[PDB]
Each structure stands twice: as C-alpha cells, then as structure tokens.
Amino acid sequence: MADITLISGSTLGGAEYVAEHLAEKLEEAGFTTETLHGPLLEDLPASGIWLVISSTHGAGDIPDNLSPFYEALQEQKPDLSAVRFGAIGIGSREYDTFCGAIDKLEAELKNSGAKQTGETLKINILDHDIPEDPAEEWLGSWVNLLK
Question: Residue ranges of the Flavodoxin-like domain?
C-alpha cells in the first residue's frame, strides 16, 4: 500500500538501491511508497503519483533503454490524465538530446496523460554515473509544491 509507486527497473532491473533511498525520504516527507522494478508496469493505477527511476543518457541501452516498459506503454497508452509523474535519473530532458530524442519515453507518458511535474530529478551517490549530482533540493521543492 502506497501513495507513490517508485518504478525502478529500466531493463526489468535498475537502480533499486537509489529507489529505496528515495522511497525512504518520500515516507519521511509524509507519504507511503512502493519500491519496485515495475513487475506489473503499474502497481498503483492510472490515478495517484508515479515516479520513474532509470538512466537513459550515457547508459541508455540500444533501443531507447526501457525495453519492456516502452513497448508496454505504447501497447495500451492508458488514461494517465488522473496521475502525475516525475522522471528521476533520466537524462533525455534537454541535455542528452544529443544522438537522437530518447525523450520518447517522457513524451509517451505525457501523451498518455501523466503531467510531468517540476523537471527530471537527478540522483547520485558514492561514484559519479550519468546525471553527476544529487538533487535532494528537487525533492524538497517538488514536495512543498505538491503540499
């Protein structure tokens, strides 16, 4: 049981460690969360809050990066107009628009109806990776905006 699904599984696997840290900070913010590698694509329905925790930029695999999830999104394009999402760790944004437009992932969610709120959250720990720099300040902003 959660108010937010933490969909953390680019290739049916992903940054579950970072998603668990995010999930804990989101429960501390006053909510309940479900750290998942998206085993059902959408454990919470097309209503509520979603978050998507993937690394589409310098580690975005060949097709797009989200091999099962992207095809599943296009297959059903559910009425996400009653939910909002936040991309996290994703680098497609504005900034790795660089060899193509793998922003397709964000675009198809927005087409299906989920507003992106704020802008893509950036996460980092121990060793530099893809978005380079943590954004607990995004988490504070996005929370006090949604309150």
Answer: 4-143
How was it solved?
NMR
- Residue 52 CB burial class (10 angstroms; 0-12, 13-18, ≥19): buried
Residue 76: give the domain boundaries: 1-147
Q: What is the 3-state secondary structure (H, E, C) of the chain?
A: CCCEEEECCCCCCCCHHHHHHHHHHHHHCCCCEEEECCCCCCCCCCEEEEEEECCCCCCCCCCCCCHHHHHHHHHHCCCCCEEEECEECCCHHHHCCCCCCCCHHHHHHHHHCCEECCCCECCCCCCCCCCCCCCHHHHHHHHHHHC
Nearest residue to 26 via CA among 50, 60, 9, 57: 50
Number of domains in the chain: 1
